[PDB]
């Protein structure tokens, strides 16, 4: 009955260990209640079954300015009724058997840990027993004792799961098992590129992010601005983002808020229009369905009128900071820090500025009801050589009336539910656990949400046509000189998400919104774009292109440690190859079409490998250890 928390105090050295529980209930006023030092040396605390969902903070009880220590420093660690966990000397929150008197094998690495090394050394331990057994990827049971280790992932191909079951028997004779899952990740290098002349100071984000992936610069094609996506395909994506990286996810409990989650930007052009498709995701259905509003079509972006922006670079030399300029009826010049800000209903601070070069701002709104929608040009130079967006020359694209959807000067916009991508990658960690930077870490808990129940109707799409004559260009300019684009999303003023993604969208994501500390400050702060725009039509002249090399991801389908006579499938996949790839598998250097089966007869430690050669003689090799 209830739950248990254990604390390893061997490194902290606190004289008294306190535990503070908050969630379904609060055990006591901070610093909390005193944990019990056991014979194990561990400190233990127990919570009744009413404490159904809690977060745990360990501290030494002393006050600020008198030697206060605590862990974690911010949110607590998750503990639900029925669970039993321990904070290790290495500060890992790990399962520790169950809250009973049985024996259990456990790992000193947290369950479901991802890793990109060739193996993860997991230490094993026993609760209420002194001998156990383990099986890895269904291997024969093997003895183990406290301190022993298992090379999780060793010998395996990358991007694969590992299953590890620990068996234990206590003094009550109950045999128990604990099954653990780990993922070995593999990340191929991607061809990236950047040009100094655009004034960018932050590299384009990679991993799951990508700017102009595979040198996709959009495609020449007439697009039908309806709500239908049959005229687009993946090859036209110019900026790939990720799902569930919008600011709200970094708050302790902000999944009730409407998402602003940009997933992907596509572009095309003909002789009349520049075209865009924009994908937005809504993974609340999967992450937090208890939040009814957010995990519903009530969170569709056109529910209200929210500003959106396509920022373009037409003349590449011009650098517009976002500042805006205009003239009164009496001729006097005025300036604003952004084209829109505290404007009409919006009484909120915030905005997005630009270090990367832009000179044009397509300023529209999320339900296409703002009659003031405009295309601004930075056509007026400031004293510092920067350019300012001009109210006096703005091209109006707004509707005359919301019901007519009759935008001026040729601007077309249609929005709808839907999803063009067939995969929706994003981190699916428990609410409140998100950490700054985890969108750049390949060992975060990444999932394809289509494998967790995502549906096409969950997401949202916008299809947009901007007439070339409203940008001062033609098709030939796009295809020989090229331009840059970025989609910005807001929640009223400040940016929230961009494609290409910019880190200033999340540099303050965990700070508190001034009007409601449960929601993110990113709604109201000042963003500053420093990544490269996505190119359309052609590359900037001084572009340095980093070509990813031809490489291979190789390994076994079962973890090292199988039994003799077990068939072991060796697998290989290649990346960035030219034409036909020829694989050549070996065991101890002895050769054994993209895979092959190897049955070892005798025990021992083997070297498995593959050499891969493509049609231009490019070679890639991998060699790994497999033990039986
Ligand atoms: Ca269409
Ligand atoms: Ca996003
Ligand atoms: Ca920010
Ligand atoms: Ca912001």
Coordinates of C-alpha atoms and ligand atoms in Angstrom, one line a residue:
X1 CA 0.0 0.0 0.0
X2 CA 1.4 3.4 -1.0
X3 CA 4.7 4.4 -2.4
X4 CA 8.3 4.5 -1.3
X5 CA 11.3 6.8 -2.0
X6 CA 14.9 6.0 -1.2
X7 CA 17.8 8.5 -1.1
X8 CA 21.5 7.6 -1.4
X9 CA 23.3 10.1 0.9
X10 CA 26.8 8.8 0.5
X11 CA 27.9 11.8 -1.7
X12 CA 25.7 14.6 -0.4
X13 CA 26.6 13.9 3.2
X14 CA 23.6 15.7 4.6
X15 CA 23.2 15.4 8.4
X16 CA 19.4 15.1 8.0
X17 CA 17.5 14.1 4.8
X18 CA 14.1 15.7 4.3
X19 CA 11.6 14.7 1.6
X20 CA 8.9 17.1 0.3
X21 CA 6.0 15.5 -1.7
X22 CA 3.6 17.6 -3.7
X23 CA 0.9 16.6 -6.1
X24 CA -2.2 14.7 -5.2
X25 CA -1.3 15.7 -1.7
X26 CA 1.4 17.6 0.2
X27 CA 3.1 15.5 2.9
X28 CA 4.0 18.5 5.0
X29 CA 5.2 22.1 4.8
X30 CA 8.7 22.6 3.3
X31 CA 11.3 21.3 4.0
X32 CA 9.0 18.3 4.3
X33 CA 9.2 15.3 6.6
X34 CA 12.3 13.5 7.8
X35 CA 13.4 10.4 6.0
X36 CA 14.5 7.4 8.0
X37 CA 18.2 6.3 7.8
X38 CA 18.1 2.5 7.3
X39 CA 20.7 -0.3 7.8
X40 CA 21.2 -0.3 4.1
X41 CA 22.7 3.2 4.6
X42 CA 19.9 4.5 2.4
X43 CA 17.3 6.9 3.6
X44 CA 13.7 5.8 3.2
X45 CA 10.3 7.6 3.2
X46 CA 6.9 6.1 2.6
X47 CA 3.6 7.6 1.4
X48 CA 0.0 6.4 1.8
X49 CA -2.1 5.3 -1.1
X50 CA -3.8 8.7 -1.2
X51 CA -0.5 10.2 -2.5
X52 CA -1.5 9.0 -6.0
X53 CA 0.7 11.2 -8.2
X54 CA 3.5 13.1 -6.5
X55 CA 6.8 15.0 -7.2
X56 CA 9.7 14.5 -4.8
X57 CA 12.3 17.0 -3.6
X58 CA 15.2 15.9 -1.4
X59 CA 16.7 18.6 0.8
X60 CA 18.8 18.9 4.0
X61 CA 16.3 21.1 5.8
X62 CA 18.6 24.1 6.4
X63 CA 17.3 27.5 5.3
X64 CA 18.7 29.8 2.6
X65 CA 21.8 31.6 3.8
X66 CA 22.4 28.8 6.4
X67 CA 23.6 26.0 4.1
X68 CA 20.4 24.9 2.3
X69 CA 20.9 22.0 -0.2
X70 CA 18.3 20.2 -2.3
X71 CA 17.9 17.9 -5.3
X72 CA 16.3 18.5 -7.8
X73 CA 16.7 22.3 -7.8
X74 CA 13.4 22.9 -9.7
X75 CA 10.7 20.4 -10.4
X76 CA 10.4 17.2 -8.3
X77 CA 11.0 13.6 -9.4
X78 CA 7.9 11.5 -10.4
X79 CA 6.5 9.0 -7.9
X80 CA 3.1 7.4 -8.1
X81 CA 1.3 5.1 -5.8
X82 CA 2.5 1.5 -6.3
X83 CA 6.1 2.6 -7.3
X84 CA 9.3 2.3 -5.3
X85 CA 12.3 4.4 -6.5
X86 CA 15.7 5.5 -5.3
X87 CA 18.0 8.4 -6.1
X88 CA 21.4 6.9 -6.6
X89 CA 24.9 8.2 -5.7
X90 CA 25.1 9.3 -9.4
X91 CA 21.7 11.2 -9.0
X92 CA 19.7 8.8 -11.2
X93 CA 16.0 8.4 -10.4
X94 CA 15.6 4.7 -10.8
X95 CA 13.1 2.0 -10.1
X96 CA 14.0 0.0 -7.0
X97 CA 11.9 -3.1 -7.1
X98 CA 8.3 -2.6 -5.8
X99 CA 6.9 -1.5 -2.4
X100 CA 6.6 -5.0 -1.0
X101 CA 9.0 -7.4 0.8
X102 CA 9.9 -9.4 -2.3
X103 CA 13.3 -9.5 -3.9
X104 CA 14.0 -7.8 -7.2
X105 CA 16.8 -7.3 -9.6
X106 CA 17.2 -3.7 -10.7
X107 CA 19.5 -1.5 -12.8
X108 CA 21.4 1.6 -11.7
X109 CA 20.5 3.2 -15.0
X110 CA 17.0 4.5 -15.4
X111 CA 14.6 2.4 -17.4
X112 CA 14.0 3.5 -21.0
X113 CA 17.4 5.3 -21.3
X114 CA 18.6 6.1 -24.8
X115 CA 22.3 6.2 -25.7
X116 CA 24.4 6.8 -28.8
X117 CA 27.6 4.9 -27.7
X118 CA 28.2 1.4 -29.0
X119 CA 27.2 0.0 -25.6
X120 CA 25.9 1.3 -22.3
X121 CA 27.4 -0.2 -19.2
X122 CA 24.5 -0.8 -16.9
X123 CA 25.3 -1.9 -13.3
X124 CA 23.0 -4.5 -11.7
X125 CA 22.0 -4.7 -8.1
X126 CA 19.7 -6.9 -6.0
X127 CA 17.1 -5.8 -3.4
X128 CA 16.5 -8.3 -0.6
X129 CA 18.7 -11.0 -2.3
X130 CA 22.4 -11.5 -3.1
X131 CA 22.3 -13.5 -6.3
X132 CA 20.2 -13.0 -9.4
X133 CA 20.0 -13.9 -13.1
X134 CA 19.5 -11.9 -16.2
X135 CA 18.5 -12.4 -19.8
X136 CA 19.3 -9.9 -22.6
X137 CA 17.3 -9.9 -25.8
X138 CA 15.9 -13.3 -24.7
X139 CA 19.3 -14.9 -24.0
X140 CA 19.8 -17.8 -21.7
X141 CA 19.6 -16.9 -18.0
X142 CA 23.0 -15.8 -16.6
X143 CA 24.0 -15.4 -12.9
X144 CA 24.8 -12.0 -11.5
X145 CA 25.7 -10.4 -8.2
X146 CA 25.8 -6.8 -6.9
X147 CA 28.1 -4.6 -8.9
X148 CA 28.0 -6.8 -12.0
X149 CA 27.5 -5.1 -15.4
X150 CA 25.8 -5.7 -18.7
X151 CA 27.0 -4.2 -22.0
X152 CA 23.6 -3.1 -23.2
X153 CA 23.5 -2.7 -27.0
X154 CA 26.9 -4.2 -27.6
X155 CA 27.2 -5.8 -31.0
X156 CA 23.8 -4.4 -32.1
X157 CA 22.8 -2.3 -35.1
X158 CA 22.0 1.3 -34.2
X159 CA 18.4 2.5 -33.7
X160 CA 17.3 -0.6 -31.9
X161 CA 15.7 -1.5 -28.6
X162 CA 17.3 -3.8 -26.0
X163 CA 15.3 -5.9 -23.5
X164 CA 16.9 -6.9 -20.2
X165 CA 15.1 -8.9 -17.7
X166 CA 16.4 -9.4 -14.1
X167 CA 15.2 -12.5 -12.1
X168 CA 15.4 -12.6 -8.3
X169 CA 14.1 -14.8 -5.4
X170 CA 13.8 -13.5 -1.9
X171 CA 13.6 -15.2 1.5
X172 CA 9.8 -15.5 1.0
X173 CA 10.5 -17.7 -2.0
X174 CA 8.7 -15.5 -4.5
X175 CA 10.4 -15.4 -7.8
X176 CA 10.1 -11.9 -9.4
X177 CA 11.2 -10.5 -12.7
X178 CA 11.9 -6.9 -13.8
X179 CA 12.0 -6.2 -17.6
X180 CA 13.9 -3.1 -18.7
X181 CA 14.0 -1.4 -22.1
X182 CA 16.9 0.6 -23.6
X183 CA 17.3 2.2 -27.0
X184 CA 20.6 2.3 -28.9
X185 CA 20.4 5.3 -31.2
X186 CA 22.3 6.1 -34.5
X187 CA 22.4 9.4 -36.2
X188 CA 23.8 9.8 -39.7
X189 CA 25.5 13.0 -40.6
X190 CA 23.4 15.3 -42.8
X191 CA 24.7 17.7 -45.4
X192 CA 24.4 21.2 -44.0
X193 CA 25.4 24.6 -45.4
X194 CA 25.8 28.2 -44.3
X195 CA 27.0 31.5 -45.8
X196 CA 28.7 34.2 -43.7
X197 CA 27.2 37.0 -45.8
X198 CA 23.7 36.6 -44.4
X199 CA 24.8 37.9 -40.9
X200 CA 23.8 34.7 -39.2
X201 CA 25.6 33.8 -36.0
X202 CA 23.9 30.5 -35.0
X203 CA 24.4 27.4 -37.1
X204 CA 21.2 25.8 -38.6
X205 CA 19.7 23.4 -36.2
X206 CA 20.1 19.7 -37.2
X207 CA 19.3 16.3 -35.8
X208 CA 15.6 16.1 -36.3
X209 CA 15.6 19.7 -37.4
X210 CA 16.8 20.6 -40.9
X211 CA 17.2 23.7 -43.1
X212 CA 16.9 22.9 -46.8
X213 CA 17.2 19.1 -46.1
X214 CA 19.1 17.2 -48.8
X215 CA 19.5 20.6 -50.6
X216 CA 15.8 20.9 -51.1
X217 CA 15.2 24.6 -52.2
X218 CA 11.5 24.2 -53.1
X219 CA 10.3 23.3 -56.5
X220 CA 9.0 25.0 -59.6
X221 CA 5.3 24.1 -59.9
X222 CA 1.9 25.7 -60.0
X223 CA 0.1 25.2 -56.7
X224 CA -3.6 25.2 -56.1
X225 CA -4.3 27.3 -53.0
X226 CA -7.3 25.2 -51.7
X227 CA -7.0 23.2 -48.6
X228 CA -5.9 20.1 -50.4
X229 CA -2.4 18.8 -50.1
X230 CA -2.2 16.4 -53.1
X231 CA -0.1 19.1 -54.9
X232 CA 2.8 18.8 -52.3
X233 CA 5.3 16.1 -51.4
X234 CA 8.1 15.7 -49.0
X235 CA 10.7 16.7 -51.6
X236 CA 9.5 20.3 -51.4
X237 CA 10.2 20.8 -47.7
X238 CA 12.5 23.8 -47.2
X239 CA 12.5 23.8 -43.4
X240 CA 11.9 20.8 -41.2
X241 CA 11.0 21.4 -37.5
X242 CA 9.9 19.0 -34.8
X243 CA 6.7 18.5 -32.9
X244 CA 6.1 19.1 -29.2
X245 CA 8.9 21.6 -28.9
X246 CA 6.7 24.7 -28.4
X247 CA 7.5 26.8 -25.3
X248 CA 4.6 25.5 -23.2
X249 CA 6.2 22.1 -22.9
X250 CA 9.0 23.5 -20.7
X251 CA 6.6 24.8 -18.0
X252 CA 5.9 22.4 -15.1
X253 CA 2.2 22.2 -16.1
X254 CA 1.3 24.2 -19.2
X255 CA -0.1 21.4 -21.5
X256 CA -3.5 22.9 -21.0
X257 CA -2.5 25.9 -23.2
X258 CA -3.2 26.1 -26.9
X259 CA -0.2 24.7 -28.8
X260 CA 1.7 26.7 -31.3
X261 CA 3.7 23.8 -32.8
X262 CA 5.2 24.3 -36.3
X263 CA 6.1 21.1 -38.0
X264 CA 7.3 21.8 -41.5
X265 CA 7.5 24.4 -44.2
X266 CA 7.2 23.6 -47.9
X267 CA 7.7 26.0 -50.8
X268 CA 7.2 26.2 -54.6
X269 CA 6.9 28.9 -57.2
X270 CA 5.6 29.4 -60.7
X271 CA 5.6 32.6 -62.9
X272 CA 2.8 34.3 -60.8
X273 CA 3.2 33.2 -57.2
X274 CA 5.5 32.1 -54.4
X275 CA 3.8 29.3 -52.6
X276 CA 4.0 27.8 -49.1
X277 CA 2.5 24.9 -47.2
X278 CA 2.9 25.1 -43.4
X279 CA 2.3 22.1 -41.2
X280 CA 1.4 22.5 -37.5
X281 CA 1.2 19.6 -35.1
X282 CA -1.0 19.1 -32.1
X283 CA 0.3 16.1 -30.0
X284 CA -1.7 17.0 -26.9
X285 CA -4.1 14.2 -27.8
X286 CA -1.2 11.8 -27.0
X287 CA 0.8 13.6 -24.4
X288 CA -2.0 15.0 -22.1
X289 CA -5.5 14.0 -23.2
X290 CA -6.8 14.9 -19.7
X291 CA -6.4 18.6 -20.9
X292 CA -9.6 18.6 -22.8
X293 CA -9.4 22.0 -24.5
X294 CA -5.8 21.5 -25.8
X295 CA -6.3 17.9 -26.9
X296 CA -9.3 18.9 -29.1
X297 CA -10.2 20.9 -32.1
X298 CA -10.9 23.8 -29.8
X299 CA -7.1 24.4 -30.0
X300 CA -7.2 25.0 -33.8
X301 CA -5.1 28.1 -34.7
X302 CA -7.9 29.9 -36.5
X303 CA -10.1 29.8 -33.3
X304 CA -8.9 33.4 -32.9
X305 CA -7.0 36.0 -34.9
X306 CA -3.3 35.5 -34.0
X307 CA -0.5 37.2 -36.0
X308 CA 1.7 35.0 -38.2
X309 CA 4.7 36.1 -40.3
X310 CA 6.7 34.9 -43.3
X311 CA 10.0 36.7 -43.1
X312 CA 11.8 36.9 -46.5
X313 CA 15.2 38.1 -47.7
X314 CA 14.8 39.4 -51.3
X315 CA 17.8 41.8 -51.5
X316 CA 20.4 39.7 -49.6
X317 CA 22.6 42.6 -48.6
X318 CA 19.9 44.4 -46.5
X319 CA 19.6 43.8 -42.8
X320 CA 16.3 44.7 -41.2
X321 CA 16.1 44.4 -37.4
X322 CA 12.3 44.4 -37.2
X323 CA 12.0 48.1 -36.4
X324 CA 9.2 49.9 -38.3
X325 CA 8.9 53.5 -39.5
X326 CA 6.0 55.7 -40.7
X327 CA 4.9 59.3 -41.2
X328 CA 2.0 61.1 -39.6
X329 CA -0.5 63.4 -41.5
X330 CA 1.7 66.4 -40.6
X331 CA 4.8 64.6 -42.1
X332 CA 6.6 63.9 -38.9
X333 CA 8.4 60.5 -38.8
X334 CA 7.7 57.9 -36.1
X335 CA 9.1 54.4 -35.3
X336 CA 7.8 51.3 -33.6
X337 CA 10.1 48.4 -32.5
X338 CA 8.0 45.8 -34.5
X339 CA 5.5 46.2 -37.4
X340 CA 2.9 44.9 -34.9
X341 CA 3.1 44.8 -31.1
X342 CA 0.8 46.3 -28.5
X343 CA -1.7 46.7 -31.4
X344 CA -5.6 46.9 -31.0
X345 CA -6.7 44.1 -28.7
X346 CA -3.1 42.8 -27.9
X347 CA -2.0 44.6 -24.8
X348 CA 1.0 42.2 -24.4
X349 CA 4.7 42.8 -24.6
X350 CA 7.0 40.9 -27.0
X351 CA 8.2 40.6 -30.5
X352 CA 10.8 39.0 -32.8
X353 CA 13.8 40.8 -34.2
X354 CA 16.4 39.8 -36.8
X355 CA 20.1 39.5 -37.0
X356 CA 20.1 37.2 -40.0
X357 CA 19.3 39.3 -43.1
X358 CA 15.7 39.9 -44.0
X359 CA 14.0 42.8 -45.9
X360 CA 10.3 41.8 -46.3
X361 CA 7.7 40.8 -43.8
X362 CA 4.4 39.1 -44.9
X363 CA 2.3 40.0 -41.8
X364 CA -1.0 38.0 -41.7
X365 CA -3.2 36.4 -39.1
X366 CA -4.3 32.9 -38.1
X367 CA -7.9 32.9 -39.1
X368 CA -7.5 35.5 -41.9
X369 CA -9.8 38.1 -40.3
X370 CA -7.4 41.0 -39.7
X371 CA -8.2 43.6 -42.4
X372 CA -4.8 45.3 -41.9
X373 CA -2.8 42.3 -43.1
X374 CA 0.2 43.7 -45.1
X375 CA 3.4 43.0 -46.9
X376 CA 6.0 45.3 -45.4
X377 CA 9.3 46.3 -47.1
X378 CA 12.4 47.5 -45.3
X379 CA 13.0 50.2 -47.9
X380 CA 14.2 53.0 -45.5
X381 CA 17.7 52.9 -44.2
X382 CA 18.4 53.8 -40.6
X383 CA 21.4 55.9 -39.4
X384 CA 23.3 52.6 -38.5
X385 CA 22.9 51.2 -42.0
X386 CA 20.1 48.9 -41.0
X387 CA 16.8 49.0 -42.8
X388 CA 13.3 49.7 -41.4
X389 CA 9.9 48.4 -42.5
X390 CA 7.9 51.2 -43.9
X391 CA 4.2 51.8 -43.0
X392 CA 3.8 54.2 -45.9
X393 CA 4.8 51.6 -48.6
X394 CA 3.2 48.5 -47.1
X395 CA 1.2 46.4 -49.7
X396 CA -2.2 45.5 -48.2
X397 CA -3.3 41.9 -48.4
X398 CA -6.1 41.7 -45.9
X399 CA -9.7 40.8 -46.4
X400 CA -12.4 43.4 -46.9
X401 CA -14.7 41.1 -44.7
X402 CA -14.0 37.9 -42.8
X403 CA -16.9 36.0 -44.4
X404 CA -15.8 36.9 -47.9
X405 CA -12.2 35.8 -47.5
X406 CA -11.3 38.3 -50.3
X407 CA -7.7 39.2 -49.7
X408 CA -6.3 42.1 -51.7
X409 CA -3.5 42.3 -54.2
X410 CA -3.5 38.6 -55.0
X411 CA -2.7 37.1 -51.6
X412 CA -4.3 33.7 -51.2
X413 CA -4.6 31.8 -47.9
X414 CA -6.6 28.7 -46.9
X415 CA -6.3 26.8 -43.6
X416 CA -7.7 23.4 -42.6
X417 CA -7.1 20.4 -40.5
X418 CA -4.8 17.9 -42.1
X419 CA -1.3 16.5 -42.2
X420 CA 1.0 16.1 -45.2
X421 CA 4.0 14.4 -43.4
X422 CA 3.7 10.6 -42.8
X423 CA 5.9 10.9 -39.6
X424 CA 5.6 13.4 -36.7
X425 CA 8.9 13.3 -34.8
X426 CA 9.1 14.9 -31.4
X427 CA 10.1 14.2 -27.8
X428 CA 7.4 12.4 -25.7
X429 CA 8.7 12.7 -22.2
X430 CA 6.3 13.0 -19.2
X431 CA 4.8 16.4 -18.6
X432 CA 7.0 18.7 -16.6
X433 CA 10.2 16.7 -17.1
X434 CA 11.4 18.6 -20.2
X435 CA 14.9 20.1 -20.0
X436 CA 16.5 23.0 -21.8
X437 CA 18.3 21.9 -24.9
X438 CA 16.7 18.4 -25.1
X439 CA 15.5 19.0 -28.7
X440 CA 19.2 18.9 -29.8
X441 CA 20.0 15.7 -27.9
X442 CA 19.5 12.5 -30.0
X443 CA 19.2 10.5 -26.8
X444 CA 16.1 12.3 -25.7
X445 CA 12.9 10.2 -25.7
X446 CA 12.1 10.8 -29.4
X447 CA 9.0 9.1 -31.0
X448 CA 7.2 9.1 -34.3
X449 CA 3.8 10.1 -32.9
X450 CA 2.1 8.2 -35.7
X451 CA 3.2 5.1 -33.7
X452 CA 1.5 6.6 -30.6
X453 CA -1.9 7.2 -32.1
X454 CA -1.5 10.4 -34.0
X455 CA -4.1 11.0 -36.8
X456 CA -4.1 13.3 -39.9
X457 CA -7.0 15.3 -38.5
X458 CA -5.1 16.2 -35.3
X459 CA -2.8 18.6 -37.1
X460 CA -3.3 21.9 -39.0
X461 CA -2.1 23.2 -42.4
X462 CA -2.0 26.6 -44.2
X463 CA -1.6 27.0 -47.9
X464 CA -0.4 30.4 -49.1
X465 CA 0.2 32.2 -52.4
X466 CA 2.2 35.5 -52.4
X467 CA 2.3 37.2 -55.8
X468 CA 5.8 37.7 -57.2
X469 CA 4.8 41.2 -58.3
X470 CA 4.2 42.0 -54.6
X471 CA 7.9 41.1 -53.8
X472 CA 9.6 42.8 -56.8
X473 CA 10.9 39.6 -58.3
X474 CA 10.1 37.1 -61.0
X475 CA 10.6 33.3 -61.5
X476 CA 14.0 33.9 -63.2
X477 CA 15.2 35.8 -60.1
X478 CA 14.1 33.0 -57.8
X479 CA 15.8 30.3 -59.9
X480 CA 19.1 32.1 -60.5
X481 CA 19.6 34.4 -57.4
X482 CA 17.2 32.8 -54.9
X483 CA 15.6 34.2 -51.8
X484 CA 15.4 33.3 -48.1
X485 CA 12.3 32.6 -46.0
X486 CA 11.3 31.9 -42.4
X487 CA 7.8 31.2 -40.9
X488 CA 7.3 32.6 -37.5
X489 CA 4.4 31.7 -35.1
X490 CA 3.2 33.8 -32.2
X491 CA 0.7 33.7 -29.4
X492 CA -0.2 37.4 -29.9
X493 CA 3.2 39.2 -30.0
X494 CA 6.5 37.3 -29.2
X495 CA 7.5 34.4 -31.3
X496 CA 6.9 30.8 -30.2
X497 CA 8.2 28.6 -33.0
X498 CA 10.0 29.1 -36.3
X499 CA 10.8 27.2 -39.4
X500 CA 13.9 26.9 -39.8
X501 CA 13.8 26.6 -36.0
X502 CA 15.7 29.3 -34.0
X503 CA 17.0 28.8 -30.4
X504 CA 15.6 32.2 -29.3
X505 CA 12.2 30.5 -29.4
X506 CA 13.2 28.5 -26.3
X507 CA 15.9 30.6 -24.6
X508 CA 13.4 31.6 -21.9
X509 CA 10.8 28.8 -22.4
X510 CA 10.8 27.8 -18.7
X511 CA 10.4 31.3 -17.3
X512 CA 7.1 32.5 -16.0
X513 CA 4.5 34.4 -18.0
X514 CA 3.9 37.7 -16.3
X515 CA 0.1 37.4 -16.2
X516 CA 0.0 33.6 -15.4
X517 CA 3.0 32.0 -13.9
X518 CA 1.8 28.6 -15.0
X519 CA 2.5 29.5 -18.7
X520 CA 5.6 30.4 -20.5
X521 CA 7.3 33.8 -20.7
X522 CA 8.1 33.1 -24.4
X523 CA 4.7 34.6 -25.2
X524 CA 5.9 38.1 -24.2
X525 CA 9.7 38.2 -24.5
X526 CA 11.9 39.6 -27.3
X527 CA 13.3 37.0 -29.8
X528 CA 16.2 37.6 -32.1
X529 CA 16.7 35.4 -35.2
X530 CA 20.3 34.3 -35.7
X531 CA 20.0 31.0 -37.7
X532 CA 20.0 31.0 -41.5
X533 CA 16.7 31.4 -43.4
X534 CA 15.6 28.6 -45.6
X535 CA 16.7 29.2 -49.2
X536 CA 14.3 29.1 -52.1
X537 CA 15.3 28.6 -55.7
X538 CA 19.1 29.0 -55.3
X539 CA 21.9 29.2 -52.7
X540 CA 23.6 32.3 -51.5
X541 CA 26.8 32.9 -53.5
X542 CA 29.3 32.4 -50.7
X543 CA 27.7 29.2 -49.4
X544 CA 30.0 26.6 -47.9
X545 CA 28.5 23.2 -48.3
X546 CA 29.4 20.5 -45.8
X547 CA 28.9 17.2 -47.6
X548 CA 28.0 14.3 -45.3
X549 CA 30.1 11.3 -46.2
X550 CA 28.9 7.9 -47.3
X551 CA 28.5 5.9 -44.0
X552 CA 26.9 2.7 -42.7
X553 CA 24.8 1.7 -39.7
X554 CA 25.7 -2.0 -39.0
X555 CA 25.2 -4.6 -36.3
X556 CA 23.4 -7.6 -35.0
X557 CA 19.6 -7.9 -34.4
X558 CA 20.2 -9.4 -30.9
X559 CA 22.4 -8.1 -28.1
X560 CA 25.8 -9.5 -27.5
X561 CA 25.5 -12.4 -25.0
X562 CA 23.5 -15.0 -26.9
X563 CA 23.8 -18.7 -26.6
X564 CA 25.8 -21.0 -28.9
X565 CA 23.7 -22.2 -31.9
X566 CA 21.5 -19.1 -31.8
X567 CA 21.0 -17.6 -35.2
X568 CA 22.3 -14.0 -35.2
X569 CA 21.1 -11.7 -37.9
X570 CA 23.7 -9.2 -39.1
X571 CA 22.2 -6.0 -40.6
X572 CA 23.5 -3.1 -42.6
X573 CA 22.1 0.2 -43.9
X574 CA 23.8 3.0 -45.7
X575 CA 23.5 6.7 -46.0
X576 CA 24.6 9.3 -48.6
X577 CA 25.7 6.5 -51.0
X578 CA 25.9 6.9 -54.8
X579 CA 24.1 4.1 -56.7
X580 CA 24.4 0.4 -55.8
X581 CA 26.0 -0.4 -52.4
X582 CA 27.8 -3.7 -52.0
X583 CA 28.0 -5.0 -48.5
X584 CA 30.6 -7.6 -47.4
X585 CA 30.0 -9.2 -43.9
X586 CA 32.8 -10.8 -41.9
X587 CA 33.2 -12.6 -38.6
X588 CA 36.8 -12.6 -37.3
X589 CA 37.7 -11.4 -40.8
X590 CA 36.0 -14.4 -42.4
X591 CA 33.3 -13.5 -45.0
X592 CA 29.9 -15.0 -44.3
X593 CA 22.3 -9.1 -49.8
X594 CA 21.8 -6.2 -47.2
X595 CA 21.8 -8.7 -44.3
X596 CA 23.0 -12.1 -43.4
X597 CA 22.6 -14.8 -40.8
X598 CA 25.4 -16.0 -38.6
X599 CA 25.1 -19.0 -36.2
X600 CA 28.2 -19.2 -33.9
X601 CA 28.9 -22.7 -32.7
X602 CA 31.6 -22.2 -30.0
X603 CA 31.7 -19.8 -27.1
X604 CA 34.0 -16.8 -27.1
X605 CA 34.3 -13.1 -28.1
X606 CA 33.9 -12.5 -31.9
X607 CA 34.5 -9.5 -34.1
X608 CA 31.6 -8.9 -36.5
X609 CA 31.9 -6.4 -39.3
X610 CA 30.9 -5.2 -42.7
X611 CA 32.6 -3.3 -45.5
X612 CA 30.3 -1.3 -47.8
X613 CA 31.3 0.1 -51.2
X614 CA 29.0 2.2 -53.4
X615 CA 29.2 2.9 -57.2
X616 CA 31.9 5.6 -56.9
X617 CA 34.2 3.5 -54.8
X618 CA 33.3 5.3 -51.6
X619 CA 33.9 2.9 -48.7
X620 CA 32.5 2.7 -45.2
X621 CA 33.3 0.1 -42.5
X622 CA 32.0 -0.9 -39.1
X623 CA 33.4 -3.4 -36.7
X624 CA 31.8 -4.5 -33.4
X625 CA 32.1 -7.0 -30.5
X626 CA 29.7 -9.9 -30.1
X627 CA 30.1 -12.4 -27.2
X628 CA 28.7 -15.9 -26.7
Ligands
LIG1 CA1 -3.4 22.5 -52.8
LIG2 CA1 7.5 22.7 -33.6
LIG3 CA1 12.9 34.0 -26.4
LIG4 CA1 9.3 34.4 -27.7

